[PDB]
Design a protein around this ligand. Structure first.
Ligand SMILES: Cc1cc2nc3c(=O)[nH]c(=O)nc-3n(C[C@H](O)[C@H](O)[C@H](O)COP(=O)(O)OP(=O)(O)OC[C@H]3O[C@@H](n4cnc5c(N)ncnc54)[C@H](O)[C@@H]3O)c2cc1C
Ligand SMILES: O=C1O[C@H](CO)[C@@H](O)[C@H](O)[C@H]1O
Ligand SMILES: O=C1O[C@H](CO)[C@@H](O)[C@H](O)[C@H]1O
Length: 569
């Protein structure tokens, strides 16, 4: 009565895709476990313009970092969705993907089958894009039909409120004058440019298109698909027998009524609890660094000491200006390259970074207490360097939107910092807060690039034709950071005012085991027969764009791999 073919732990962005796809086989039973509950009628969620409203609420996990020792010692809140739909219920709504070559790097790493060419069909499979209205088109909204799906569960489209306005027209021209092309679609593998981005929006209903509205609710009539909400997965438990290779028997759970029980999986357990939880579940299950497991009175079952290591996140800053009059128009995204941002200074910046890569790798070794090797980190960082410098992938995202009245707001983040951190359990109590350490600002590039982006935005606000609309910069403003200001004043300000960008990846990274990978190219946890991780944990490097599009695609592909593996096994 407690047995299912598959258990999916976490009914979030990724997990709901897997549960959907596996349950396409009517003879396969799937159990979803989700710690939160439906947010179908939570207005903080449904509101197409409600991003931010849910922060601090019962549907925000509000995870907490440790003191960030490279950024002045301040701890950072790391937000995440506690809801059916996971973090797709509380996030921003921009639908953007990744650079083609940066997905190709996954296969170069040694992960067979993971290239842009191989992933593109799964982006398409996930997506149902609604074409823009005539008025949205006049404002700049466009897409390439060849790279957008029309049949998938995730509705994508442009806001009902999208209109031409002085701001969006001026930003297009001003970015073009800075040498950044207007591009019609950032989602065909080439992201560099200025774009009127689409969103995860159901335009028929004008509501947020979260992962549950996409992949769960229209399918919840399936009798082979089962959901336990308000149910916390504590750890996996294992079949007992001298298979040295570990076989999961099921998942231990705590219900809302406080009952603590087991559910069993006949085939596989799929862990989709997010990059800040999936590794904890592995550790609590005895899969991880034996030093940490033993310290916390957990019997080691698989010696896999990079569980929770290789955490990579971005950090987010904001600037603002004031118009002479009211500012209006479509929200915009710009993805500039290193040379777009740095102009005549690019060669200097590249030379400096080049000269630092080995030092960054050496410095990263201690983060994992020696469980990644310098030589291997150096090769990883060389891949990332080549993406930035040789392929000229975007190094920044810059968002602009009207800020109400005469205000214009920009938020921005460096896309590819080199800092790595980690996350680990603090006890064997599943409710105890983890030790989460992204190491924001660890390396010079990370802060120098952020500063370069900020200076670039300062310049944009003062450039034509935008400067005809914008009276002045209000944040930071010239009093706080004078026009004559050096790189370092900007870095200090950015450190004082940043937040997490809430894009953590890599804590159960898909890489060869021999360079510290946690899952193989089919997302199977090393040393296990039948456990996978399918969520942001597995991304081995950061990507340029907004994570959900890529996680949907990765989970779509994973689902096919799981089905293939069942047929022979
Ligand atoms: C505020 C914010 C804004 C963002 N902005 C954007 C954006 O505009 N666009 C974009 O694409 N991305 C954005 N991101 C990132 C993106 O939303 C996430 O990377 C993505 O949703 C993560 O998906 P996931 O499947 O890894 O995990 P999640 O969606 O977080 O799913 C994990 C699920 O597991 C559940 N869970 C966790 N622990 C347990 C347990 N022990 N037992 C049972 N269930 C459990 C959770 O409650 C959750 O439902 C944003 C993130 C945040 C926090
Ligand atoms: O993807 C994102 O877009 C958001 C803007 O839409 C930003 O605020 C979040 O920090 C970021 O995670
Ligand atoms: O997290 C934050 O703290 C910053 C100050 O510490 C603030 O300026 C930003 O607006 C905010 O995102």
């Amino acid at each position: 009565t407690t047995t299912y073919d598959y258990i999916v732990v976490g009914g979030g962005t990724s997990g709901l895709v897997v549960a959907n796809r596996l349950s396409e086989n009517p003879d396969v039973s799937v159990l979803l476990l989700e710690a939160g509950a439906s947010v179908f009628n939570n207005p903080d969620v449904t509101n197409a313009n409600g991003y931010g409203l849910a922060f601090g609420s019962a549907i925000d996990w509000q995870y907490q970092s440790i003191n960030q020792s490279y950024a002045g010692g301040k701890q950072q809140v790391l937000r995440a969705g506690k809801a059916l739909g996971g973090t797709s219920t509380i996030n921003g709504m921009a639908y953007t993907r990744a650079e083609d070559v940066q997905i190709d790097v996954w296969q170069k790493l040694g992960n067979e089958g993971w290239t842009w060419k191989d992933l593109l069909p799964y982006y398409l499979k996930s997506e149902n894009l609604t074409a823009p209205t005539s008025s949205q088109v006049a404002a700049g909204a466009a897409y390439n039909p060849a790279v957008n799906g029309k049949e998938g569960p995730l509705k994508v489209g442009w806001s009902g409120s999208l209109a031409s306005g002085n701001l969006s027209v001026a930003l297009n021209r001003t970015f073009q004058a800075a040498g950044v092309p207007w591009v019609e679609d950032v989602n065909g593998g080439k992201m560099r440019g200025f774009n009127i981005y689409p969103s995860t929006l159901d335009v028929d209903l004008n509501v947020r298109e979260d992962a549950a509205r996409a992949y769960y609710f229209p399918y919840d009539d399936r009798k082979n698909l089962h959901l336990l909400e308000n149910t916390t997965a504590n750890r996996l438990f294992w079949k007992n027998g001298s298979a040295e290779e570990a076989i999961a028997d099921g998942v231990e759970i705590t219900s809302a009524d406080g009952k603590v029980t087991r559910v069993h999986a006949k085939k596989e357990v799929i862990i989709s609890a997010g990059a800040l939880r999936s590794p904890l579940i592995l550790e609590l299950s005895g899969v991880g660094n034996p030093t940490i497991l033993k310290k916390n009175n957990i019997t080691p079952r698989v010696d896999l000491p990079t569980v929770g290591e290789n955490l990579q996140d971005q950090f987010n800053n904001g600037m603002a200006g004031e118009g002479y009059g009211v500012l209006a128009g479509a929200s915009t995204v710009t993805y500039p390259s290193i040379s777009d941002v740095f102009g005549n200074e690019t060669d200097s910046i590249v030379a400096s970074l080049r000269s630092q890569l080995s030092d960054y790798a050496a410095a990263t070794v201690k983060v994992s207490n020696g469980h990644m090797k310098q030589e291997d980190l150096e090769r990883l960082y060389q891949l990332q360097f080549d993406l930035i410098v040789k392929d000229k992938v975007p190094i920044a995202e810059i968002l602009f939107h009207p800020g109400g009245g005469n205000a214009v707001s920009s938020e921005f983040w460096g896309l590819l910092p080199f800092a790595r951190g980690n996350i680990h359990i603090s006890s064997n109590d599943p409710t105890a807060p983890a030790a989460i350490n992204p190491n924001y600002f660890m390396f010079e590039w990370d802060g120098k690039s952020q500063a370069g982006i900020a200076k670039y935005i300062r310049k944009i606000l003062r450039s034509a034709p935008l400067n005809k609309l914008i009276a002045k910069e209000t944040k930071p403003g010239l009093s706080e950071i004078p026009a004559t200001a050096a790189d370092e004043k900007w870095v200090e300000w950015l450190k004082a005012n940043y937040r997490s960008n809430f894009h953590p990846v890599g804590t159960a990274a898909m890489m060869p085991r021999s360079i510290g990978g946690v899952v193989d190219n089919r997302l199977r946890v090393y040393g296990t027969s039948n456990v996978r991780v399918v969520d942001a944990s597995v991304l081995p490097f950061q990507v340029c764009g907004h994570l959900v599009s890529t996680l949907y695609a990765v989970a779509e592909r994973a689902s096919d791999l799981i089905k293939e593996d069942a047929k022979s096994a």
